[PDB]
C-alpha cells in the first residue's frame, strides 16, 4: 500500500553509475503517466523525466544523453539508469504519479563525491 | 491551501474549491469579499 515506494539512492563516486527501483503496488498501465522530481537541499524541486502511457517520452536538457527512462510492463515500477553522474546531481529525487488523482512518494537522496 | 478566494465550486459549510496551478483541485474556506474601513 506504500505505493511509489523508491529504493535505490545513495552515495557514489563521480562518473558512475546508478539504479533506482520506484514501485508501486497498482497497475502500472492503468496509473497512465509517471514522472520524477529532485529537490537539492535549498533548491526548489524540478522535474527530471517524463513517460506517458502512450509511450512519449522527453527529459530536462541536464537529462538527456546521460540517464533513460525505462519501464518494465512484468514487475509495476519504473527504472531510471543513472550514469556518469556528476556533483551537481546531489538532490533527492522522487518518482511522482497520477491517475484521476495525485500520488505521491518519499523519495531518496543521492549524493555524488568528488 | 490556507489563502481564500471568492468561491467558484460550492461544496458547503463555508469550504469552496477551483482549478488551478500537490493536487490539481484545491479547497478553502471561501472569503466574503475584500476588507476595507472608512
Ligand atoms: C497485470 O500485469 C502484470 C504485468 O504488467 C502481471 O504481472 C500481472 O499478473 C497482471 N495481473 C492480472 C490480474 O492480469
Ligand atoms: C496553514 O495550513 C496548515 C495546514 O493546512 C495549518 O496547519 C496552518 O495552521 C495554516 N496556517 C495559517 C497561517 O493559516
Known amino acids: 500500500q506504500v505505493q511509489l515506494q523508491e529504493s535505490g539512492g545513495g552515495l557514489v563516486q563521480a562518473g558512475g553509475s546508478l539504479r533506482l527501483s520506484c514501485a508501486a503496488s497498482?497497475?502500472?498501465?492503468?496509473?497512465?503517466?509517471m514522472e520524477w522530481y529532485h529537490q537539492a537541499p535549498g533548491k526548489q524541486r524540478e522535474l527530471v523525466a517524463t513517460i506517458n502511457r502512450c509511450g512519449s517520452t522527453n527529459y530536462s536538457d541536464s537529462v538527456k544523453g546521460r540517464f533513460i527512462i525505462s519501464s518494465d510492463n512484468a514487475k509495476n515500477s519504473v527504472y531510471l539508469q543513472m550514469n556518469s553522474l556528476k556533483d551537481e546531481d546531489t538532490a533527492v529525487y522522487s518518482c511522482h504519479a497520477r491517475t484521476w488523482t495525485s500520488y505521491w512518494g518519499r523519495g531518496t537522496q543521492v549524493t555524488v563525491s568528488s | 491551501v490556507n489563502n481564500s478566494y471568492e468561491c467558484d465550486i460550492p461544496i458547503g459549510a463555508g469550504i469552496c474549491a477551483s482549478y488551478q496551478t500537490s493536487q490539481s483541485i484545491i479547497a478553502y474556506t471561501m472569503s466574503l469579499g475584500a476588507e476595507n474601513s472608512v
Open positions: 497498482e497497475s502500472i498501465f492503468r496509473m497512465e503517466l
